[PDB]
Amino acid sequence: MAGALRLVLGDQLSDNLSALVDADLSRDQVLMVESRVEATAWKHHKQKLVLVWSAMRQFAERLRARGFNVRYVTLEDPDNTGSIGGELRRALEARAFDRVIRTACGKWGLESHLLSLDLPVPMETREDDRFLCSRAQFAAWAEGRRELRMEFFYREMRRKTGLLMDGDQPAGGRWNFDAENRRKLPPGLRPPERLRIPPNPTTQTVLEQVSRGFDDHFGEVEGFGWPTNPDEATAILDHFIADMLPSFGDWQDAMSWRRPFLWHSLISPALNIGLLDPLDICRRAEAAWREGRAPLNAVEGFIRQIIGWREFVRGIYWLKMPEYAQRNALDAQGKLPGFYWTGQTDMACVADTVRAAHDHAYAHHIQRLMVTGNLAMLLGVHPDAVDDWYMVVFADAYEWVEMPNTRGMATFADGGIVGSKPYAASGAYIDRMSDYCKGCRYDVKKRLGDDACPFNALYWDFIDRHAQRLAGNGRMMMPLRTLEKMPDAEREAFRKQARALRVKMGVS
Numbered sequence: 001m002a003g004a005l006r007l008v009l010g011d012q013l014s015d016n017l018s019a020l021v022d023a024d025l026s027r028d029q030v031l032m033v034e035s036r037v038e039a040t041a042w043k044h045h046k047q048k049l050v051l052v053w054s055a056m057r058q059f060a061e062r063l064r065a066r067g068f069n070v071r072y073v074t075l076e077d078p079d080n081t082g083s084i085g086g087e088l089r090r091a092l093e094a095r096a097f098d099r100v101i102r103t104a105c106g107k108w109g110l111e112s113h114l115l116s117l118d119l120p121v122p123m124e125t126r127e128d129d130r131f132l133c134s135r136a137q138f139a140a141w142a143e144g145r146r147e148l149r150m151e152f153f154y155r156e157m158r159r160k161t162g163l164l165m166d167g168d169q170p171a172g173g174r175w176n177f178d179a180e181n182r183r184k185l186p187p188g189l190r191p192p193e194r195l196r197i198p199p200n201p202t203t204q205t206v207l208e209q210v211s212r213g214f215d216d217h218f219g220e221v222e223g224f225g226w227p228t229n230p231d232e233a234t235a236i237l238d239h240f241i242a243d244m245l246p247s248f249g250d251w252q253d254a255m256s257w258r259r260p261f262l263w264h265s266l267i268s269p270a271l272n273i274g275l276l277d278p279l280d281i282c283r284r285a286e287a288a289w290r291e292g293r294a295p296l297n298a299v300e301g302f303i304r305q306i307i308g309w310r311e312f313v314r315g316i317y318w319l320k321m322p323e324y325a326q327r328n329a330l331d332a333q334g335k336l337p338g339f340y341w342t343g344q345t346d347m348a349c350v351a352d353t354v355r356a357a358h359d360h361a362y363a364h365h366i367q368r369l370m371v372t373g374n375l376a377m378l379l380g381v382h383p384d385a386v387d388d389w390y391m392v393v394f395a396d397a398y399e400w401v402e403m404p405n406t407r408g409m410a411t412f413a414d415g416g417i418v419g420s421k422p423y424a425a426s427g428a429y430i431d432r433m434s435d436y437c438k439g440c441r442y443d444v445k446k447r448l449g450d451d452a453c454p455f456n457a458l459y460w461d462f463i464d465r466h467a468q469r470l471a472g473n474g475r476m477m478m479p480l481r482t483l484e485k486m487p488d489a490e491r492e493a494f495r496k497q498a499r500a501l502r503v504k505m506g507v508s
C-alpha cells in the first residue's frame with residue numbers, strides 16, 4: 001500500500017517497457033538518473049551523451065504528462081551520488097516503498113551488480129521484452145548445436161514473427177536473397193542527401209552542458225543531427241522507407257569517400273535506446289514490399305539485419321558471458337595505433353572511417369567490419385584495446401551488441417562463435433568495393449615497399465601466422481593453398497614487411 005519504485009535507464013525509453021507496464025500512478029514513483037559512472041565507464045563520444053540525456057529528459061516529461069510521479073536526478077544535482085545503486089538507496093531513504101521494479105539492462109556487469117544489491121525492500125527484475133527473442137528462448141534454440149549459425153536462427157525468427165511469410169512458406173520461395181555479386185558505386189551516381197534532425201530546445205541545452213563539462217571526451221558535437229524523441233525518430237524511419245529502402249542491398253557493401261551514410265537507415269542509435277520498436281520497423285518494411293513500393297530483395301535484406309543479426313548477437317552475448325569478454329583466441333597482444341583516435345594516417349580508407357566516427361559518431365557496417373575491424377585483427381591488437389575504441393566512438397554503442405560484433409565477427413578473438421571464419425581481407429577487397437585507393441598514396445597493387453598498401457602484407461602475415469589454426473575449420477581453403485604455393489623467400493619478405501609495419505604503426 002506504499003507503492004513501487006520503478007527504475008528506468010537511459011536505453012529503456014519506451015512507453016511499453018516491462019517495468020512501466022502495470023504501474024499505479026497514485027502510489028508509484030519512477031526513478032531516472034543522469035549517472036557519471038555510466039557516462040565515463042568509457043569516455044563516450046560527446047554525441048552519445050547528448051543523445052541519451054536529451055532523450056531521457058524528454059522521456060521524463062512525457063511520463064509526467066501521463067500522471068507519473070518522476071524523481072529525475074540531473075548531472076548538476078550536487079547531492080547526486082553518481083551511480084545507479086547509490087541513487088536507488090537515496091530514493092528509498094526519501095519515502096516509503098513496497099519494492100523496486102526494473103527491467104534487465106544491456107550490460108552484464110551492471111546487471112550482475114544490481115542483482116547483488118543489499119536493499120531494505122525486495123527488488124523484482126523483468127525481462128526486456130522489446131526484443132523479439134528472449135534470453136531463455138535463445139538458450140533453448142542453441143542447446144546441443146556444435147556451432148551457432150545465424151542463417152538457421154534467422155529462419156526460426158521468420159516463422160516465429162511471421163515476417164515475409166505467405167502461410168508456412170517464405171515469400172518468393174527462398175529464405176534469403178543475398179547475392180555475393182555486389183559492387184562499388186558507378187562513377188556518376190551521387191548518393192542522396194539524408195534527413196538530419198536539427199536540435200530541439202532540450203537537445204540544444206544538453207549540447208551546451210556537454211561541450212563545457214565533458215570537453216576531454218572524444219568527437220565533435222557540432223552538426224548533431226540524431227533524433228531524440230519518437231516523433232524525430234519516426235521521421236528518420238519514414239525517410240528511409242520512402243526514399244532509401246528500394247535501393248538498400250544494391251549498395252549495402254559499397255564505400256565512398258566522404259559520403260558516410262549512403263543508403264543505410266541510420267536508426268541504430270534510436271533503436272538501441274527504445275525510440276523505435278524492432279517489430280514495428282520490420283512490419284513497415286514488409287508493407288512497402290506488399291504494396292509495391294519496394295522490391296523483395298531489398299526488404300528481406302533489411303529485415304534480416306534486425307530479426308537475424310541483431311537478435312543473434314544479443315543472444316550470443318547473454319549466453320556466453322562473463323567468459324566471452326575474456327577470450328583472446330589468437331593471442332593478440334599489440335597496442336592500438338594512435339591514428340584510430342586522431343585520424344592522422346595516409347591510408348585513405350582508415351582515415352575516412354575515423355573522420356566519420358569523429359564528426360558524426362557513425363560509420364556504416366562494412367567500414368566497421370572490413371576497414372577498422374579487419375585492420376585491428378591483422379595488426380594483432382589486444383581485443384580489450386579494440387573494444388575500448390568501439391565503445392567510445394559510436395553513438396549506438398552498447399556492450400551486448402558491440403562485443404559479439406567486434407570481439408567476434410570483426411576480429412575472431414572469440415574463435416569463431418559468432419561468425420564462422422575470420423573476415424580477413426587484403427587491400428584488393430577494399431579496392432573492389434570503394435573509390436578509395438585511386439586517391440590513396442599507397443599502391444594497392446604492391447605488397448612490399450614504402451608505397452605498398454599495408455593491408456596486403458598484413459593479410460598474408462596473418463594467414464601465415466595462423467595457417468595451422470585456420471587449417472582445421474575448412475572455410476579458408478583458397479588462401480591456404482595459395483600460401484602453400486609461395487616460395488619461402490616470398491613469405492619471408494612479407495613477414496619482414498608486416499613486422500616493419502607493426503613497429504611503424506606503434507603496435508609492437
Ligand SMILES: Cc1cc2nc3c(=O)[nH]c(=O)nc-3n(C[C@H](O)[C@H](O)[C@H](O)COP(=O)(O)OP(=O)(O)OC[C@H]3O[C@@H](n4cnc5c(N)ncnc54)[C@H](O)[C@@H]3O)c2cc1C
Pocket residue numbers: 263264265266267268269271272302305306309310311313363364365366368369373390394396397398401402405406409410
Ligand atoms: C566491429 C563492429 C562493431 C559494431 N558495433 C555496433 C554497436 O556498437 N551497436 C550497433 O547497434 N551495431 C553495431 N554494429 C553493427 C552495425 O554496424 C550497425 O548496427 C549499423 O552500422 C548501424 O547503422 P544503420 O542504423 O544505418 O543500419 P542499417 O545498415 O540501416 O541496418 C539496419 C539495422 O540493422 C541492425 N544491424 C545491422 N547490422 C547489425 C549487426 N551486425 N549487429 C546488430 N545489429 C545490426 C541495426 O539495428 C541497424 O539499425 C557493429 C558492427 C561491427 C562490424
Ligand SMILES: Cc1nc2c(=O)[nH]c(=O)nc-2n(C[C@H](O)[C@H](O)[C@H](O)CO)c1C
Pocket residue numbers: 008009010011033034035036038039044048049052104105106107398
Ligand atoms: C551515457 C549513458 N548515460 C547514462 C545515464 O546517465 N544514466 C543511465 O541510467 N544510463 C546511461 N547510459 C546507459 C547505461 O550506461 C547502460 O549502458 C545501459 O543502461 C545498458 O543497459 C549511458 C550509455
Ligand code: SF4
Pocket residue numbers: 346347348349350426427428430431436437440441442443444453454455
Ligand atoms: S590502397 Fe590500401 S590503404 Fe589505401 S585506400 Fe586502398 S585499401 Fe586503403
